[PDB]
Paper text:
Surprisingly, we found that the C-terminal part of the ABD (ABD-C, the 27-residue motif identified previously for ANK repeats binding) binds to ANK repeats with an affinity ∼15-fold weaker than the entire ABD, indicating that the ABD-C is not sufficient for binding to ANK repeats. We further showed that the ABD-C fragment binds to repeats 1–6 (R1–6) of ANK repeats, as ABD-C binds to R1–6 and the entire 24 ANK repeats with essentially the same affinities. Based on the structure of the ANK repeats/AS complex, we predicted that the Nav1.2_ABD-C may also bind to site 1 of AnkG_repeats with a pattern similar to the AS peptide. In the complex structure, the extended Nav1.2_ABD-C peptide interacts with the surface of the inner groove formed by the first five ANK repeats. In particular, the hydrophobic residues of Nav1.2_ABD-C and AS occupy very similar positions on the hydrophobic groove formed by residues from ANK repeats R4 and R5, and subtle conformational differences in the finger loops of R4 and R5 can accommodate amino acid sequence differences between the two targets. Unique to Nav1.2, the binding of ABD-C extends all the way to R1 via charge–charge and hydrogen-bond interactions. We noted that Glu1112, which is completely conserved in both Na+ and K+ channels and mutation of which in Nav1.5 to Lys is known to cause Brugada syndrome in humans, occupies the identical position as Glu1622 of AS does in the ANK repeats/AS complex. In contrast to the common expectation of directly interacting with positively charged residue(s), Glu1112 of Nav1.2 is buried deeply in the groove and forms hydrogen bonds with the sidechains of Thr94 and Asn98 in the R2 and R3 finger loop.
Ankyrins are a family of scaffold proteins which play essential roles in connecting numerous ion channels, cell adhesion molecules, and receptors to the spectrin-based cytoskeleton beneath membranes and thereby provide mechanical support for plasma membranes and control the activities of excitable tissues including neurons and muscles. There are three members in the human ankyrin family: ankyrin-R/B/G (AnkR/B/G) encoded by ANK1/2/3, respectively. They all consist of a highly similar N-terminal membrane binding domain composed of 24 ankyrin (ANK) repeats, a spectrin-binding domain comprised of two ZU5 domains, and a UPA domain followed by a death domain (DD) and a variable C-terminal regulatory domain. The wide-ranging physiological functions of ankyrins are the result of ankyrin's remarkable capacity for binding to and anchoring numerous membrane targets, via their N-terminal 24 ANK repeats, to specific membrane micro-domains in coordination with spectrin-based cytoskeletal structures. The 24 ANK repeats of ankyrins form a superhelical solenoid with an extremely conserved elongated inner groove, which contains multiple quasi-independent target binding sites.
Numbering used by the authors: 1113 to 1132, 2029 to 2188, 2192 to 2217, 2221 to 2322
Amino acid sequence: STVTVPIAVGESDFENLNTESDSNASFLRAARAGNLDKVVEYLKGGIDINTCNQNGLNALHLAAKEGHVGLVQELLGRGSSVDSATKKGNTALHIASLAGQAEVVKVLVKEGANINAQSQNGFTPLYMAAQENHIDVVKYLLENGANQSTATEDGFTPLAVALQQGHNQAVAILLENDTKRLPALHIAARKDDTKSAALLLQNDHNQSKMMVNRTTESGFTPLHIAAHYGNVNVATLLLNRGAAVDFTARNGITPLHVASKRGNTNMVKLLLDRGGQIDAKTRDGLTPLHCAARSGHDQVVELLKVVT
């Protein structure tokens, strides 16, 4: 009876262990320490730039973990492939983001690292920077195209992990992105973020003054938004958690009005199934049927006529 976002755990740090072929190990230790001169010397000496440990970390991965900007530049300069993945499927960009190494993030991004790459647990750089509350990396990633909506295979998002981890600022930046002002649940409805919705809703159990039925200025609920954008999943969740199916906004507008006006067929279906009133009327006499007609959404009309 729990909603629980998965946590990116990072790479190991065996190279930090003081010793108390072996050329390779020593080379990786030099990378971990950020000793450019030593690393360059080994490379000149012929050691392979792609040398990695049992977990698949090369020197680029180690320099990035540790914020060694200069060294990251040198390795990149020498042909280190920006997006080599470790065995967990992490790129240097994942690692730097989890670790909050902002200058390193910049350097990798400018080198064309894939800003939306997913690890084999489905995590993105943004998910990592978000999980760990690395604000500046978050902002930087957003400003550079990173997509908040790229999700673990179970729909886990940066917003969801920021929420679970209690990170107010992260949550703010994530909610406030690409808008130039709705409540969070509403925004989660827009985005169709069931997990984040679930998280937000975890403390009202039992209709009117429930959080699931809070309104915006114009009296819309998360359910109205869901209906507007045609987000069936998040709508289903809200309705399961007690959203009033026939809740009227300004002008007696119901979620069914909204979905009918936007020709959102499956929303209409869902709302009907949950008992939404087929014939409710706006302050000016419109029915869901009329709203759809005035909008050429025939798909709906048909469906809507059948029911009657």
